[PDB]
C-alpha cells in the first residue's frame, strides 16, 4: 500500500536514501543505526531488510554505490568516520548481520556531514565533508580489494573559523554527468561552492554559485541527459529554492529562477532520475515539485501537503 | 495554479503551526516511488509519496503503445516538406487519417477508464482533451484549407459530433424537468413557456434534428393548432417537414434548402393571426433561427459554441466568416472558464493552435505530445528557430528544435521513470525518430538512459543489446553486464 | 429638453454634407450634418495617393503565389512597400500634428502606426527567420516600435525623482524609485538614458568612496551597457557572457556598502543578464517584459509564446489605449484580429494593411462556396479576400468624399482588385463614374477614358447628355 511506516529508529532521521533501481532505501538517524528496506515485490509494501549498529555517534549523511560495484552503502556520522559497508546475501535479513563493514575513512578531524559516491564512469570514488571544512575524495583503487580505500584529494573548503557550535552547515553533490569534466558542488553555510578536475588530476575552485543569504541546507546537481549545460539546485535557510545554470565554454553561472513559495527555510531538494522534475521541502511542511519551461524558468507544477 | 495533494490523508505529521519541522522529500528513481520524512524528535515514520496524477494502468500504457504506432506508421510524413503534385495531396491524406487514428485510440482509452474506476478525476480530463481534439480535427484535419463546399457531410458530422460530446446538456434530466406538466397558472399550455421553445431552438442550433422534432410531437403539433388556427398548423408542420430533410452532403440541396425555409417564414410571415399574441412570434423565431437570422441565432443561444455552431448550420456555411461568426458568438456569451476545454478550441477556431498545448499538457502530457507532433505533420506549427554562422550546442531538449520536438522529448523522458518495460521501446523510439537533433546528440542520451532498462528476461536483456548495436553503445552493453555478475 | 419630437435625416452624395430636421411647429431651422470622423484635409488625401501608389507599383507582387529567387526577391519588395507604408503614415501624423494638433485624429494615427511597426517587427524583417538572421534590422525595429507606442518614461518624470525632494534623509538613489527607473531604461534598450541617470548621482560619489569593490562593478557595467551588440548575434553571445561573469564576482564579493544598495545593484545586474523572474519585476507593462527578455535573455523569436504568455501573467493587457490588443494579436499569430480595430482608427490605413498582409501571404482567402455557378456579382463581400472587402469598401468610402483626385484611386483600386470578374468590375464603374466631380474639359476627357477602357457606351452616352446640357450649354 502506500500509507506511512515506521523506520525503527528512536532518534531523528538525517537521510533517506534510494539505490540505483528504486526498489530500495537506506536510512541513517541519530540512534546511531543503518536500516535498509526492501519493496517486496507482491505485497507492494516497504519491509525492513536489515537494521545494524555502525557509528558511536549520530549518522548524518547515507549513499549507495553504483550497482556495477555491489551492494555497497557508506555512511558519515559525527564520530568523525565515514564507514563502508558490502550486503552479504548469505546472512538472513533483520539478522544486524547482512552488510559487513569494508572499511573505515579516520582522516577526518571534525565530525562528518555529507558523503556521496562519485558518478560511476570514475570508479569506486567519494567525497565527505565535516567541520574541519576540509573536503576529501577517496578511491577504491583496485575494484577488487573493496578496502584498498585510498585518499585521492583534499581541499580547504572554509577558514573554520567556527566552533562546531556556530551553526555549520555543509553538502556535497556530484555532477552525474557520464560526458562532461569530472566536477562536484559543495555547500558550507552561506557559500557553495564549485571544483572541477583540472588537467593536472587535482581539484581547483571553478566557480561559485552567489546568492544566499543564510546557511545552505540542501543543494544536489541534476542529471543532464539531453542537456549540455548543467543545473544544480540549492534549499536555502533564507526560504528560498535557487537553481542555476552553468555552461561551460570556462564556467559561466546563471541563476535561473528564486522561489520562496515555502516561506521559510527549503530543508530537501531533489532531482528526477532523467532531471526532468525538481523537489523541495520546507517548515510549511509541503512538498513541491517543479518542471522547466519552454523558456527554461521553473514553475510548480504540484504541492504534496502534511 | 497547482495541484495540492494529500500525502497520506490518514495520517499527515505536520500539524501544529509550533515548531516548523524540518521535512525532506527525495525523488525516486520511479515515479510511483518517492519518499518523504521528518529530522525531528518522535517523528519517525517514513512516508512513501507517488507523483501527483500519476498514470500506472495497464488502459494508459495501452493507450500510449497505441499513440506509438501510430507515430511510428506515419513514416516520413510526420515530418512536413514546406509524387511531385500528389506529394501535397497525399500527405494530408495520410495526416488526416493518423489524425483520426489518434482520435480512436483516445474514445477507446477513455472507454476503459469509464468502466475501470468509471467517472474519476481522470476521466473528466480525459473527455476535455478529447473535446480540444474533435475541435482541432474538424477546423484543420478535414477541409485541408478549403471551404465546407469541399466536403460538407464530413465537416458537419465532426462539427456535430464536437459540440454534442463537449458538454452533457440537454440533458434528457432536462428535458423533463419542463415536462413536468406543472399548470401554476390558469392554463398552462404544454408549450407557452418560453422555456419550452428556447429548449426547441437550443435543440435545433445544436443539429439535434431528431430530438427536436420530438418535442414538438410532444405537446401541441395537432392538438392547440390543427384546431385553433388552421393556418399556423401548416407551417408548423412542413417547417419539422424541412427539418426532417436538413442536408448534411450536397451544399447545393442546402443552398434551396435555406431557399424553402427563407419562403416559409415569409408567407408565415404576413398571414393568418388566429394564435396567441405569443405563440405567434414563438413561431416565427423558431422559423428565424431555422432560416440563419444572425440576430435570433445569437438571443436562443446559451454559450458561444451553440451560436458558432448555428451561424454554420443554418446562416451561412462558410469558414470564411469564423472569424465573425466567433465574435459575434463571444459578444452574445463570454468564454466559461469552469472548463479547460472551450478556450483551446477558442484559440483553435481563431488561428492560435500553438496555444493550446500548455493547456492539453496539463489534462494528459501524452496526448498532448502526440497532438503537437500530427499537428506539426499537418504543418499547423513549425520550428522558426535558428543556427549561427555555420559553426558544442546538442542539448536536443530544449527550445532550440521544435515546441513539438519538446514535448515529444519530454514525453519520452517521463516514459523511462514509469519504469515499464513495455513503453521503455517507445521512449527509446521517440528520441530515435526524433526528426531534430544530431545523431550524435541522440546517441548520448540514449547512452544515459538504456543503463535504467527494467529487464528481466533474456528477450528484454537481447533488445538492450540490439539497442547497443544499432547504436554503437558496445562500452555500455559490457557496462549492464558488470552488473549482472554483481547483481 | 425630452419632447419627443419627429427628427428625419438625410444622407448626401457628398460625405461632407448631409442633414437633419424636423416635422414640428416651430421647428423650422435645417441642420447640415457631416458624418463623424470623416478626413477632408489635403495631408489626408496626399496620403491616401501615396498609399495608392505603393500598390499600384507593387505590380505582379501584391498578389501571393501560394525562380528559386522569385520566394526571396518577392519578401524583398513587399518588405520595402511596407516600410513606405510605414513612411506615408509618419508624413501623415506629421503634416497633423502641424496643421490641427495633438487632436483625436493625431492620437488614432500614432496608435495606427504603432500596431503597424509592431506588425513589420514581426513579419516584415526576417520573413520567418530568426533574429540571427539580421539582428540589426530586428533590434533596431523593436526598439523602435517600443519607444513609440507610449510617451513614458515622459522626461516630465524624470526630473519627477530627481525633485531633489529629501523627506526619509534620501541618499538620492538609495531611493526604490530610482532603480525601477533605471532598470525600465534598460528593458527599452534606453541604454543611453540609463547611463546618464547614473552619472546624475553616485556613480563616483557614495561609491567611489564608501565600496572601491562595488564601484568596479557599477562603473565596467556602464561600460558593458555603453557596448550593447546590435549587429553580430556572436558578439552577443560573448556580451551576455561578460555580464553573467560580472554578476557572478560581485554576486559574491566586498559588501562595503547598504544592505539595500548591496541588492540594488545585484538586481541591476540580474536584468542585464537576463534573468527571467527580474526582467518581469521590474517591468510595468506586459511590453517591457516582452521586450527586456529579447534584449537580454535569450534574443529568439522562437520563444516570443513563451515570452507573451510571462509578460502577460505579470501586466494584463491596458484596455486604455486601443493599440495593445492588437500588438497582443500580432505577436501571438493571430494577424486577421488587428483589422477589426485598425480600421476603427483609420479606414485607409486599415485597408491597405490588409493588403500588405495579404501581399506577405499572411491572410488568404479560404472561400470557396460553389460548384454551381456562372450573375453573382460580388465585388463587395465575404466570397473574395477579407482585403478585397477592404479595398473595395475604401474605394466605396472614396466616392463620396467628393475630392476629383482621389477618383481615379477609387477606381483603380476596384480596377485593380485581384478578384471579381472583369464584367462585375464593369457593372461598378459603371455605377459609379457618373457621381464623377467634373468640372474641367481633362476631367471629362478622364471619365471618357475609363468609359473606354471599359466599354460603358450606354454610360459614356449619359456622361455626354449631362454635357449636352452642362458642356454644349456650360463651357459657353
Same mark, same amino acid.
Given at each position: 500500500?502506500?500509507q506511512?511506516?515506521?523506520?525503527?529508529?528512536d532518534?531523528?532521521?538525517? #537521510?533517506?536514501?534510494? #539505490?540505483?533501481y528504486?526498489?530500495?532505501?537506506?536510512?541513517?538517524?541519530?540512534?546511531?543505526?543503518?536500516?535498509?528496506?526492501?519493496?517486496?515485490?507482491?505485497?507492494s509494501?516497504w519491509?525492513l531488510?536489515?537494521?545494524?549498529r555502525?557509528?558511536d555517534?549520530?549518522?548524518?549523511?547515507?549513499?549507495?554505490?553504483?550497482?556495477?560495484?555491489?551492494?555497497?552503502?557508506?555512511?558519515?556520522?559525527y #564520530?568523525?568516520?565515514?564507514?563502508?559497508?558490502e550486503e552479504?546475501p548469505d546472512?538472513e535479513?533483520?539478522?544486524?548481520?547482512?552488510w559487513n563493514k569494508?572499511?573505515?575513512?579516520?582522516?577526518?578531524?571534525?565530525?562528518?556531514?555529507?558523503?556521496?559516491?562519485?558518478?560511476?564512469?570514475?570508479?569506486?570514488?567519494?567525497?565527505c565533508?565535516g567541520?574541519?571544512?576540509?573536503?576529501?575524495?577517496?578511491?577504491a583503487?583496485?575494484?577488487? #580489494?573493496?578496502?584498498?580505500?585510498?585518499?585521492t584529494?583534499?581541499?580547504?573548503?572554509?577558514?573554520?573559523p567556527?566552533?562546531?557550535?556556530?551553526?555549520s552547515?555543509?553538502?556535497?553533490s556530484?555532477?552525474?554527468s557520464?560526458?562532461?569534466?569530472e566536477?562536484?558542488?559543495?555547500?558550507?553555510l552561506?557559500?557553495?561552492?564549485?571544483?572541477?578536475?583540472?588537467?593536472?588530476?587535482?581539484?581547483?575552485?571553478a566557480?561559485?554559485?552567489?546568492?544566499?543569504?543564510?546557511?545552505?541546507?540542501?543543494?544536489?546537481?541534476?542529471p543532464?541527459?539531453?542537456?549540455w549545460?548543467?543545473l544544480?539546485?540549492?534549499?536555502?535557510?533564507?526560504?528560498?529554492?535557487r537553481?542555476?545554470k552553468?555552461?561551460?565554454?570556462?564556467?559561466?553561472?546563471?541563476?535561473?529562477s528564486?522561489?520562496?513559495?515555502?516561506?521559510?527555510?527549503?530543508?530537501?531538494?531533489?532531482?528526477?532520475?532523467?532531471?526532468?522534475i525538481l523537489?523541495?521541502?520546507?517548515?510549511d511542511?509541503?512538498?513541491?515539485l517543479?518542471?522547466?519551461?519552454?523558456?527554461?524558468?521553473?514553475?510548480?507544477?504540484?504541492?504534496?501537503?502534511? | 495554479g497547482?495541484?495540492?495533494?494529500?500525502?497520506?490523508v490518514?495520517?499527515?505529521?505536520?500539524?501544529?503551526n509550533g515548531?516548523?519541522?524540518?521535512?525532506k522529500?527525495?525523488?525516486?528513481?520511479l515515479?510511483?516511488?518517492?519518499?518523504?520524512?521528518?529530522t525531528?524528535?518522535?517523528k519517525?515514520?517514513?512516508?512513501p509519496?507517488?507523483?501527483?496524477?500519476?498514470?500506472?494502468?495497464?488502459?494508459?500504457?495501452?493507450?500510449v503503445?497505441?499513440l506509438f504506432?501510430?507515430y511510428?506508421?506515419l513514416?516520413?510524413?510526420r515530418?512536413?516538406?514546406?509524387?511531385?503534385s500528389n506529394?501535397?495531396?497525399?500527405?494530408?491524406?495520410?495526416?488526416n487519417?493518423?489524425?483520426?487514428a489518434?482520435?480512436?485510440?483516445?474514445?477507446?482509452?477513455?472507454?476503459?477508464?469509464k468502466?475501470?474506476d468509471?467517472?474519476?478525476?481522470?476521466?473528466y480530463?480525459?473527455?476535455?482533451?478529447l473535446?480540444?481534439?474533435?475541435?482541432?480535427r474538424?477546423?484543420?484535419?478535414?477541409?485541408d484549407?478549403?471551404?465546407?463546399?469541399e466536403?460538407?457531410?464530413?465537416?458537419?458530422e465532426?462539427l456535430?459530433?464536437?459540440?454534442?460530446?463537449?458538454?452533457?446538456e440537454p440533458?434528457?434530466?432536462y428535458?423533463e424537468?419542463?415536462?413536468?406538466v406543472?399548470?401554476?397558472?390558469?392554463?398552462?399550455?404544454?408549450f407557452?413557456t418560453?422555456?419550452?421553445?428556447?429548449?426547441?431552438?437550443?435543440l435545433?442550433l445544436?443539429?439535434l434534428?431528431s430530438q427536436?422534432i420530438?418535442?414538438?410531437?410532444?405537446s401541441?403539433?395537432?392538438?392547440?393548432?390543427?384546431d385553433?388556427?388552421?393556418?399556423?398548423?401548416?407551417?408548423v408542420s412542413?417547417?419539422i417537414?424541412?427539418?426532417?430533410?436538413?442536408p448534411?452532403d450536397?451544399?447545393?440541396?442546402f443552398?434551396?434548402?435555406?431557399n424553402? +425555409?427563407?419562403?416559409?417564414?415569409?408567407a408565415?410571415?404576413?398571414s393568418?393571426?388566429?394564435?396567441?399574441?405569443e405563440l405567434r412570434?414563438?413561431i416565427?423565431?423558431f422559423?428565424?433561427?431555422?432560416?440563419?437570422?444572425?440576430?435570433?441565432?445569437l438571443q436562443?443561444?446559451r454559450?458561444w459554441?451553440?451560436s458558432?455552431?448555428?451561424?454554420?448550420?443554418?446562416?451561412?456555411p462558410?469558414?470564411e466568416?469564423?472569424?465573425?461568426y466567433?465574435?459575434?458568438?463571444?459578444?452574445?456569451?463570454? +468564454?466559461?472558464?469552469?472548463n479547460?476545454?472551450?478556450?483551446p478550441?477558442?484559440?483553435?477556431?481563431?488561428?492560435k493552435?500553438?496555444?493550446?498545448?500548455?493547456?492539453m499538457?496539463s489534462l494528459?502530457?501524452?496526448?498532448?505530445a502526440?497532438?503537437?507532433?500530427?499537428?506539426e505533420?499537418?504543418?499547423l506549427?513549425?520550428?522558426?528557430?535558428?543556427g549561427?554562422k555555420?559553426?558544442?550546442?546538442?542539448?536536443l531538449?530544449?527550445?532550440?528544435?521544435?515546441?513539438?520536438?519538446?514535448?515529444?522529448?519530454s514525453?519520452?523522458?517521463?516514459?523511462?521513470?514509469?519504469?515499464?518495460?513495455?513503453?521503455?521501446?517507445?521512449?527509446?523510439?521517440l528520441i530515435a525518430?526524433?526528426?531534430?537533433?544530431?545523431?550524435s546528440?541522440k546517441?548520448?542520451?540514449?547512452?544515459?538512459?538504456?543503463?535504467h532498462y527494467?529487464?528481466?528476461?533474456n528477450?528484454?536483456?537481447?533488445?538492450?543489446?540490439?539497442?547497443?548495436?544499432e547504436?554503437?553503445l558496445p562500452?555500455?552493453?559490457k557496462?549492464?553486464?558488470?552488473?549482472?555478475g554483481?547483481?
Open positions: 500500500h502506500m506511512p511506516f515506521d523506520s525503527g529508529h532518534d531523528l532521521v538525517h #537521510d533517506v536514501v534510494y #539505490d540505483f528504486g526498489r530500495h532505501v537506506a536510512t541513517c538517524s541519530s540512534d546511531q543505526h543503518i536500516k535498509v528496506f526492501k519493496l517486496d515485490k507482491d505485497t509494501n519491509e531488510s536489515d537494521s545494524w555502525a557509528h555517534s549520530s549518522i548524518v549523511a547515507i549513499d549507495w554505490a553504483s550497482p556495477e560495484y555491489g551492494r555497497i552503502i557508506a555512511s558519515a556520522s #564520530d568523525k568516520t565515514v564507514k563502508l559497508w552479504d546472512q535479513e533483520c539478522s544486524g548481520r547482512r569494508l572499511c573505515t575513512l579516520n582522516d577526518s578531524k571534525g565530525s562528518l556531514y555529507s558523503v556521496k559516491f562519485a558518478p560511476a564512469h570514475l570508479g569506486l570514488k567519494l567525497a565533508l567541520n574541519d571544512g576540509i573536503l576529501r575524495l577517496y578511491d583503487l583496485e575494484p577488487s #580489494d573493496l578496502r584498498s580505500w585510498t585518499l584529494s583534499e581541499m580547504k573548503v572554509l577558514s573554520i567556527p566552533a562546531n557550535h556556530l551553526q552547515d555543509f553538502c556535497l556530484w555532477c552525474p557520464r560526458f562532461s569534466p566536477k562536484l558542488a559543495v555547500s558550507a552561506e557559500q557553495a561552492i564549485i571544483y572541477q578536475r583540472g588537467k593536472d588530476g587535482k581539484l581547483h575552485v566557480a561559485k554559485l552567489p546568492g544566499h543569504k543564510s546557511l545552505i541546507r540542501s543543494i544536489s546537481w541534476a543532464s541527459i539531453g542537456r549545460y548543467q544544480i539546485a540549492t534549499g536555502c535557510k533564507d526560504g528560498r529554492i537553481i542555476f552553468i555552461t561551460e565554454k570556462n564556467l559561466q553561472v546563471e541563476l535561473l528564486e522561489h520562496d513559495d515555502h516561506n521559510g527555510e527549503v530543508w530537501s531538494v531533489s532531482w528526477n532520475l532523467t532531471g526532468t523537489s523541495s521541502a520546507g517548515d511542511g509541503k512538498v513541491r517543479w518542471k522547466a519551461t519552454y523558456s527554461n524558468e521553473f514553475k510548480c507544477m504540484s504541492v504534496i501537503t502534511a | 497547482a495541484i495540492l495533494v494529500p500525502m497520506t490518514n495520517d499527515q505529521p505536520i500539524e501544529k515548531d516548523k519541522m524540518p521535512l522529500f527525495k525523488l525516486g528513481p515515479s510511483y516511488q518517492n519518499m518523504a520524512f521528518i525531528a524528535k518522535d519517525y515514520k517514513l512516508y509519496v507517488r507523483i501527483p496524477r500519476l498514470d500506472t494502468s495497464k488502459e494508459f500504457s495501452a493507450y503503445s497505441g504506432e501510430i511510428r506508421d513514416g516520413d510524413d515530418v512536413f516538406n514546406v509524387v511531385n506529394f501535397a495531396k497525399e500527405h494530408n491524406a495520410t495526416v487519417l493518423a489524425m483520426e489518434i482520435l480512436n485510440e483516445l474514445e477507446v482509452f477513455i472507454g476503459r477508464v468502466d475501470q468509471g467517472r474519476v478525476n481522470r476521466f480530463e480525459l473527455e476535455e482533451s473535446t480540444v481534439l474533435n475541435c482541432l474538424t477546423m484543420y484535419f478535414i477541409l484549407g478549403q471551404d465546407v463546399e466536403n460538407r457531410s464530413e465537416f458537419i465532426s456535430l459530433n464536437w459540440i454534442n460530446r463537449s458538454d452533457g440533458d434528457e434530466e428535458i424537468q419542463v415536462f413536468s406543472k399548470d401554476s397558472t390558469a392554463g398552462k399550455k404544454v407557452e418560453q422555456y419550452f421553445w428556447k429548449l426547441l431552438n437550443q435545433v445544436r443539429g434534428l427536436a420530438g418535442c414538438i410531437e410532444r401541441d403539433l395537432l392538438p392547440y393548432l390543427s385553433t388556427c388552421a393556418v399556423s398548423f401548416d407551417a412542413d417547417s417537414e424541412l427539418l426532417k430533410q436538413y448534411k450536397s451544399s447545393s440541396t443552398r434551396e434548402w435555406k424553402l +425555409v427563407l419562403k416559409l417564414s415569409q408565415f410571415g404576413s393568418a393571426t388566429d394564435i396567441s399574441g412570434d414563438y416565427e423565431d422559423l428565424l433561427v431555422i432560416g440563419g437570422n444572425q440576430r435570433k441565432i436562443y443561444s454559450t459554441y451553440e458558432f455552431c448555428g451561424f454554420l448550420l443554418y446562416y451561412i462558410s469558414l466568416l469564423s472569424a465573425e466567433l465574435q459575434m458568438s463571444l459578444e452574445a456569451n463570454v +468564454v466559461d472558464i469552469t479547460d476545454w472551450e478556450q478550441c477558442v484559440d483553435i477556431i481563431s488561428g493552435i500553438h496555444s493550446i498545448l500548455p493547456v499538457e494528459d502530457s501524452c496526448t498532448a502526440f497532438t503537437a507532433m500530427i499537428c505533420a499537418k504543418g506549427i513549425e520550428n522558426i528557430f535558428e549561427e555555420n559553426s558544442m550546442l546538442e542539448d531538449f530544449s527550445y532550440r528544435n521544435g515546441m513539438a520536438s519538446y514535448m515529444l522529448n514525453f519520452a523522458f517521463e516514459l523511462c521513470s514509469l519504469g515499464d518495460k513495455e513503453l521503455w521501446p517507445v521512449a527509446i523510439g525518430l526524433s526528426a531534430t537533433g544530431t545523431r546528440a546517441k548520448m542520451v540514449i547512452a544515459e538512459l538504456l543503463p527494467p529487464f528481466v528476461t528477450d528484454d536483456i537481447e533488445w538492450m543489446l540490439s539497442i547497443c548495436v547504436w554503437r562500452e555500455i552493453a557496462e549492464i553486464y558488470t552488473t549482472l554483481n547483481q
